[PDB]
Each structure stands twice: as C-alpha cells, then as structure tokens.
Amino acid sequence: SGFRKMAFPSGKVEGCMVQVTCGTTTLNGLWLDDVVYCPRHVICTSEDMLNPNYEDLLIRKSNHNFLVQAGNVQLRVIGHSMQNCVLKLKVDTANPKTPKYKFVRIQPGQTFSVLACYNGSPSGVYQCAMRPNFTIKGSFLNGSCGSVGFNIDYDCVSFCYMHHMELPTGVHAGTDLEGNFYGPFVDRQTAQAAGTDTTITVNVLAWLYAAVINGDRWFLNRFTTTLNDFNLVAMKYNYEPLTQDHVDILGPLSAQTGIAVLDMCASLKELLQNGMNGRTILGSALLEDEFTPFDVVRQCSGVT
Amino acid sequence: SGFRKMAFPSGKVEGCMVQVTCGTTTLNGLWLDDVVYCPRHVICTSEDMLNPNYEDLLIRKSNHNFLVQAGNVQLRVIGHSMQNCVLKLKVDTANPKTPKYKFVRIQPGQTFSVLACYNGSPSGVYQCAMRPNFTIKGSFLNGSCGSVGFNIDYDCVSFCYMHHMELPTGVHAGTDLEGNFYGPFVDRQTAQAAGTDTTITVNVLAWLYAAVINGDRWFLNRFTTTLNDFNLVAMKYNYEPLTQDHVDILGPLSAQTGIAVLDMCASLKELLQNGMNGRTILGSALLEDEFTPFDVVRQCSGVT
Ligand SMILES: COc1ccccc1O[C@H](C)CNC(=O)c1cc(=O)[nH]c2ccc(F)cc12
Numbered sequence: 055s056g057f058r059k060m061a062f063p064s065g066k067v068e069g070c071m072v073q074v075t076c077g078t079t080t081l082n083g084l085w086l087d088d089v090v091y092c093p094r095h096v097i098c099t100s101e102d103m104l105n106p107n108y109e110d111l112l113i114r115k116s117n118h119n120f121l122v123q124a125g126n127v128q129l130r131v132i133g134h135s136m137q138n139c140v141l142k143l144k145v146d147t148a149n150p151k152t153p154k155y156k157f158v159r160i161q162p163g164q165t166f167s168v169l170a171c172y173n174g175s176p177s178g179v180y181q182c183a184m185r186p187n188f189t190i191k192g193s194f195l196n197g198s199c200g201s202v203g204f205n206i207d208y209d210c211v212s213f214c215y216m217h218h219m220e221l222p223t224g225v226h227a228g229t230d231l232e233g234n235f236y237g238p239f240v241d242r243q244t245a246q247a248a249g250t251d252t253t254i255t256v257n258v259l260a261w262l263y264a265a266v267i268n269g270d271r272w273f274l275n276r277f278t279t280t281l282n283d284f285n286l287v288a289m290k291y292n293y294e295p296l297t298q299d300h301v302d303i304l305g306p307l308s309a310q311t312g313i314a315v316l317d318m319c320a321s322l323k324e325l326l327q328n329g330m331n332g333r334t335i336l337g338s339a340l341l342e343d344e345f346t347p348f349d350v351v352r353q354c355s356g357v358t
Numbered sequence: 359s360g361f362r363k364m365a366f367p368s369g370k371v372e373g374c375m376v377q378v379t380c381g382t383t384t385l386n387g388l389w390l391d392d393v394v395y396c397p398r399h400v401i402c403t404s405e406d407m408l409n410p411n412y413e414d415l416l417i418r419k420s421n422h423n424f425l426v427q428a429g430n431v432q433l434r435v436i437g438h439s440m441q442n443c444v445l446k447l448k449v450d451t452a453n454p455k456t457p458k459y460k461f462v463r464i465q466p467g468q469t470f471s472v473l474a475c476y477n478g479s480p481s482g483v484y485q486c487a488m489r490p491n492f493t494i495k496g497s498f499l500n501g502s503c504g505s506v507g508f509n510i511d512y513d514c515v516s517f518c519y520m521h522h523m524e525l526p527t528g529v530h531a532g533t534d535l536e537g538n539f540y541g542p543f544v545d546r547q548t549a550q551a552a553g554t555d556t557t558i559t560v561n562v563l564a565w566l567y568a569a570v571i572n573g574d575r576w577f578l579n580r581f582t583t584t585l586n587d588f589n590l591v592a593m594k595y596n597y598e599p600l601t602q603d604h605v606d607i608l609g610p611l612s613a614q615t616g617i618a619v620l621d622m623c624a625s626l627k628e629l630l631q632n633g634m635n636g637r638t639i640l641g642s643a644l645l646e647d648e649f650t651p652f653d654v655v656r657q658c659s660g661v662t
C-alpha cells in the first residue's frame with residue numbers, strides 16, 4: 055500500500071547523457087547509437103536568442119565546433135544536421151550503453167519521467183505530465199536544456215521530451231526527439247504565454263481509484279451522474295471534458311474496485327463543488343492529475 | 359525555476375539489485391562487493407512471521423538454500439550470517455557494478471530516494487523522508503522487501519534504508535544497512551502502531567524558502583516571532599520544535615532570499631493559524647515537509 059509520484063528507474067537514460075558545447079554555450083545531449091541529439095539553440099549566444107535564424111547560424115558551424123563529452127572522454131563529431139528544433143550530431147562511436155529505444159510523441163495528459171541534467175551529468179529524476187496547454191511543470195535551471203523525458207516498458211525506453219526552454223511564467227516547453235515542439239512554442243526568447251492549464255480529468259479519476267485501492271474512501275458518495283452532467287461541472291472547473299474513450303480506459307480500475315466510472319465521476323463532482331473541507335486524499339489537499347490510469351495500475355500491481 | 363519532489367538518479371543502485379529466494383519466499387537483495395544484503399525475514403514462511411525465532415529458523419538453512427540471481431545469472435553463495443535484522447550472503451563474485459558507497463543511519467526528518475524493486479528488478483524511484491515516528495510513507499507491495507533508500511553525493515551512494523514491512527496502518531518500517539530498525543519496530547507480524555506523525559518544521563521552512571526563490575510569495579507577511587513563541591504554535595499543530603540548530607541550517611536559504619529565519623517562522627505561524635484559504639504554494643495545498651534545507655539548496659543550484 056501507499057501511493058507516490060513515482061518516476062521510472064533512470065539508469066538506462068543516465069548511460070545516454072552527454073555534454074554538448076558549441077562556442078560558449080553548454081547543454082545536455084542524448085547519445086543513442088552513433089547520434090547525439092541536442093536542442094539546436096546550443097549554437098546561439100544569449101543575444102542570438104532574441105531573434106535567431108538557425109539555418110544562418112548553423113552555416114558558421116562545422117563538426118569540430120560541437121564539443122561532445124561522455125563522462126570524461128571526448129567524442130569525435132563526424133557529421134551534423136538540423137531536424138526541426140534539434141541537432142543530430144553524428145559521432146564516430148556508438149554508445150555502448152544504448153538501451154532498446156523508441157522516439158514517441160505524447161498526447162497532453164500523458165505522464166513521463168524527467169532526468170534533469172547539467173553538463174551531461176544527472177542531477178535528479180521526477181515525474182511530469184504534458185499539460186493540456188502543452189507545457190510541463192518541471193524543475194529546470196540554466197544548463198538543463200537537452201534533459202529528456204521518457205517512459206520505460208520493461209527494457210525499452212520511449213523518449214518523448216527534450217527540454218528547450220522556460221517561459222516567462224516559470225513553466226517549461228520542449229520538443230519530442232524529432233525536434234517538434236509540443237504546443238505552439240518556438241525556440242526564441244519572445245512573449246510566449248501559455249493557454250489555460252486545465253485539469254486532466256481522466257488522471258484525477260485514476261488517482262481517486264488509486265485512493266480507494268489504498269484505503270482512502272471518505273470521498274465516496276451515494277451519487278451517480280452522466281457523462282454530459284459531469285462535463286457541465288468539469289467545464290465550470292476548467293477540467294478537460296471526459297469522453298467514452300476515457301471511461302473505457304478507466305474500465306480495469308472500475309473492475310478492480312467495483313466502483314462504476316460514473317459513480318466515481320459523481321464523487322469527483324461533489325469534490326469539485328464542495329471542496330476537500332480541510333481533508334486529504336493520498337496525502338494531498340488538492341485533486342492530483344499527473345497519474346494516468348496506466349500509472350495507477352502499474353504502481354498498484356508492481357510492473358518492473 | 360519550478361520545484362519538484364526529485365529523487366536521485368537511480369542507476370548506481372539499479373546495478374546492485376538482485377533477487378533472493380529462500381524456500382518459497384522471494385525478495386530483493388543489495389549486492390555490494392561480494393556481499394548480498396537482504397531482510398532476514400526471507401527465511402520465514404507466512405506462518406513463521408507471527409512469532410519467528412530467527413536464530414532457530416536460520417539453523418535449518420545452508421548456503422545452497424539462498425538462491426541469488428543477478429539479472430538472469432545465478433550467484434554462488436559461499437557464506438551467510440545474520441547481522442541484527444539483515445542477512446549478509448557472501449557470494450563468490452564481487453559486483454562489477456558496485457559504486458562507491460557508505461552505510462549511514464539517518465535521523466528523522468532526513469530525506470532519501472527509494473528504488474522500489476520486485477524480484478530483483480527496479481519498478482520505480484521516489485523521494486521519501488524518515489518520519490519523526492520512524493516510519494516512512496512509501497509505495498510498497500508484496501515482494502518489495504529488500505528495496506533500499508539512499509542519498510548520492512556526486513559518485514558516493516550512502517545507503518540508509520532497507521524495506522522490511524508494512525504496518526497495519528499502511529505506513530512502512532525498515533532498517534539501516536546494519537539491520538537495525540528505525541524506531542521501535544520489529545520484524546514480526548504483530549500489533550505495531552506508529553506514534554504521532556508530527557510535521558518536520560525545518561523542512562517546511564526550507565520549502566517556504568524554495569517557494570520564495572521560485573516566485574510564490576503571497577504567504578510572506580509583515581510579522582516576525584521568536585523561537586519560543588513559534589514553538590508554542592508548532593506544539594499546538596503537532597509540528598516538531600524548532601531549535602537554534604535548525605535556524606543555523608536555514609542560514610544559507612535566509613541569506614539567499616534576504617528573509618530572516620524568524621520572519622519565515624512568522625509566515626509559517628500565520629499559515630498554521632489561518633490555513634491556505636484555498637490557495638497553493640509550489641502547486642501544493644498543504645505545507646510540504648519532505649524537502650530538507652540541503653535538498654532545497656541542491657535543487658535550486660543544480661548539484662549533479
Ligand atoms: C528564454 O530562453 C530561451 C528561449 C527560447 C529557447 C531557449 C531558451 O533558453 C536558453 C537558450 C537557455 N535556457 C536555459 O538554460 C534555462 C532553461 C530552463 O528551463 N530554466 C532556466 C532557468 C534559469 C536560466 F538562467 C536559464 C534556464
């Protein structure tokens with residue numbers, strides 16, 4: 055029993071972290087096979103970030119201008135190319151620690167672990183969720199760019215995020231491993247405001263199921279609702295609309311606890327309307343939305 | 359910017375996890391040099407757990423009864439001994455992945471990362487704190503015993519916890535790596551209730567400093583207090599008494615923000631007396647106490 059914001063074991067990703075320096079800028083790179091992936095803004099000076107023309111900036115860079123260091127040893131850069139907002143630095147050595155991997159582009163509401171790195175070195179690991187406004191609420195300081203987000207399925211690492219920037223509001227934006235930003239963000243130091251950070255309803259319900267499984271049941275009520283009635287309340291509280299797809303995904307949690315999804319929706323509705331009344335659920339005084347239904351099942355079953 | 363419940367990168371510990379089986383019981387072991395450490399209750403059947411005599415149970419066990427598997431390969435057990443509540447299984451092969459390490463016994467209020475494991479395999483990593491009642495609020499299922507808690511200082515892993523049991527109240531108890539339980543808990547399936555789970559005051563203040571550093575300042579007030587006045591309020595709210603040692607440890611956070619420790623204590627006092635009023639601090643609706651002053655500095659500076 056017990057429920058924690060758990061991240062995947064980070065070892066497989068730690069073995070891929072390298073340092074990339076170009077001129078006076080140093081950030082993190084991801085070394086997989088003979089390619090090192092890093093944010094293209096490594097070629098920019100702080101002045102360039104205001105209005106960078108990446109293709110023009112890249113013309114002044116050669117293979118020898120990209121310094122790649124794996125631990126204390128230097129990798130030889132034999133090629134470089136820009137794919138969207140990432141640079142792919144071809145090195146002459148395949149990473150011997152390359153795990154089985156995939157590059158996946160996640161949907162909002164999906165969770166992942168982040169291995170925060172500085173100078174190619176891991177500092178920590180934490181669990182994130184792609185917000186519905188395509189930002190993440192991370193913990194990143196200067197030098198953290200190129201730190202990656204990932205999920206692990208037994209021995210396969212699915213990389214889904216690469217950190218690129220912090221918006222003026224303290225929230226984070228980045229790309230998938232093909233260099234495409236999540237959301238409308240650009241790798242430029244300009245006015246980029248995030249949209250509404252709505253709550254991931256299906257995740258909150260999954261977390262309420264986790265609470266019931268772990269003994270916290272005070273919020274269970276005598277009511278039920280419909281998808282349309284629940285959604286009227288969800289709209290009022292800036293919660294994402296719940297679809298039949300979400301109800302289907304909550305099927306196994308519903309089966310395990312014996313609590314119908316719409317009954318859990320009615321519990322959630324009363325919690326939204328009445329608040330927690332100074333009470334807690336799984337040690338939290340707010341409704342947690344960064345656990346997917348898959349995370350709840352995984353944690354509650356012990357998938358390794 | 360941003361503040362997260364961050365765990366240490368777990369790779370160095372993942373390389374030490376092994377599976378230990380004795381009879382029909384399988385749990386996790388920690389392989390460091392040529393010794394595998396595991397909870398002594400691996401020798402018990404579920405029936406034995408009600409009133410086990412470990413010395414007597416151990417007489418019926420030989421080296422060949424302890425099956426140790428590292429990944430898919432079997433380790434040869436050449437010796438076994440019981441130290442307090444842990445078994446030390448001497449194997450014929452030194453773990454080639456043994457990091458630099460120490461065994462430390464932590465004090466209540468100190469935090470650590472847990473690498474939850476099942477069958478010698480890592481499932482996830484999360485950040486914990488040794489509660490003032492010597493329990494931890496973890497996430498452990500059947501088979502998680504022998505999972506360890508640790509801190510990392512650059513390349514040295516300080517192991518501080520080994521998981522042994524779940525109390526009937528859903529909280530967790532375990533030992534340091536010398537096999538001594540934290541608190542008064544015993545490795546027996548009996549009525550073991552935990553004492554008062556008081557709040558780790560110095561950690562809450564460290565977290566309030568983290569909030570100020572990251573932009574959340576609404577709770578800062580026009581007041582100050584004294585250690586004795588603050589402690590009268592702390593006693594009323596089941597917070598640990600704040601000492602001058604704690605004030606000294608908060609010195610660097612006080613210096614960084616320019617907010618005197620006693621002024622932050624007065625902010626904390628008003629938060630205890632008036633509540634959050636439906637507001638949040640670093641995305642939490644309660645006062646977080648599982649970040650030490652060292653964790654706040656580390657996260658806010660980027661120690662790798
Ligand atoms: C406005 O910057 C950009 C605009 C678009 C694209 C990239 C930008 O980022 C520049 C290149 C490098 N950024 C960081 O290293 C960085 C990342 C972070 O998440 N938090 C930080 C906190 C403090 C700090 F001094 C720096 C950071």
Ligand SMILES: COc1ccccc1O[C@H](C)CNC(=O)c1cc(=O)[nH]c2ccc(F)cc12
Pocket residue numbers: 055399407498499500501502503522523524530544545546547548
């Ligand atoms: C009362 O048990 C003991 C009393 C004293 C000492 C050890 C005991 O633990 C037995 C040997 C094995 N325990 C687990 O595997 C276990 C650990 C956990 O943290 N959560 C669990 C959730 C469900 C479940 F079925 C088992 C566990």
